[PDB]
């Protein structure tokens, strides 16, 4: 019981030799501002990945 | 009969605490008045800047 208790997918094609999946993230903040304001904070993002065979 | 009359008045130039020209300028609008009141046409001081 190995295919019965774990999911089976179909993404890969016969000729493929490897695969890869990625993750992501973000950072940021906010503040209390006034009428004539030129000072505003910013945000960004990241990401990684892994492999198989 | 009578002679009509016409007058002229010039407006003032500026008011206290008013931006004069459209040159390079920068307002910081993320500040808090810690204590007391602040007049419009006067300088200020920075007691403390928060870290987070």
Report on this structure:
This is part of a larger assembly, with chains A (53 residues) and B (52 residues). Chain A has 53 residues and is mainly beta. Chain A is elongated and about 65 Å long. In chain A, 0% of the residues are buried. With 52 residues, chain B is mostly loops. Chain B has no helices and no strands. Chains A and B meet through loops of A and loops of B. Chain A: This is Major capsid protein. Chain A: It comes from Escherichia phage T1 (Bacteriophage T1).
Q: What's the gist of this structure?
A:
Chain A has 53 residues and is mainly beta. Chain A has strands at residues 19-27, 44-52.
Per DSSP, the total helix count of chain B is: 0
State which percent range the strand residues of chain A make up.
25-35%
Structural class of chain A: mainly beta
What is the approximate shape of chain A?
A: elongated
- Biggest chain-to-chain interface with counts: A-B, 9 and 6 residues
Distance linking N and C termini of chain B: 79 Å
User: Helix-strand pattern of chain A, N to C?
Assistant: EE
Radius of gyration of chain B: 22 Å
Please indicate the percent range of residues of chain B in DSSP E strands (runs of 2 or more): under 5%
Structural class of the helices, strands and pairings of chain B?
little secondary structure
Integer-rounded radius of gyration of chain A? 22 Å
Topology:
This is part of a larger assembly, with chains A (53 residues) and B (52 residues).
Chain A: E1 19-27, E2 44-52
Antiparallel strand pairs in A: 1-2
Chain B: no helix or strand
Features of the shown structure:
part of a larger assembly; 2 chains; A: about 55 residues; mainly beta; two-stranded antiparallel sheet; B: about 50 residues; little secondary structure; Major capsid protein (chain A)
């Amino acid at each position: 019981s190995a295919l019965r208790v774990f999911p089976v997918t179909t993404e890969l094609s016969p000729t493929d030799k490897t695969f890869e999946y990625m993750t992501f993230d973000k950072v940021g903040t906010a503040q209390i501002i006034a009428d004539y304001t030129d000072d505003l904070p910013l945000v960004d993002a990241l990401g990684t990945s892994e492999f198989g065979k | 009969a009578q002679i009509n009359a016409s007058y002229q008045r010039d407006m003032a130039i500026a008011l206290p605490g008013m931006v004069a020209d459209t040159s390079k300028y920068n307002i910081d609008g993320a500040c808090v008045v810690n204590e007391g009141d602040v007049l419009v046409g006067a300088a200020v001081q920075v007691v403390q800047a928060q870290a987070v």
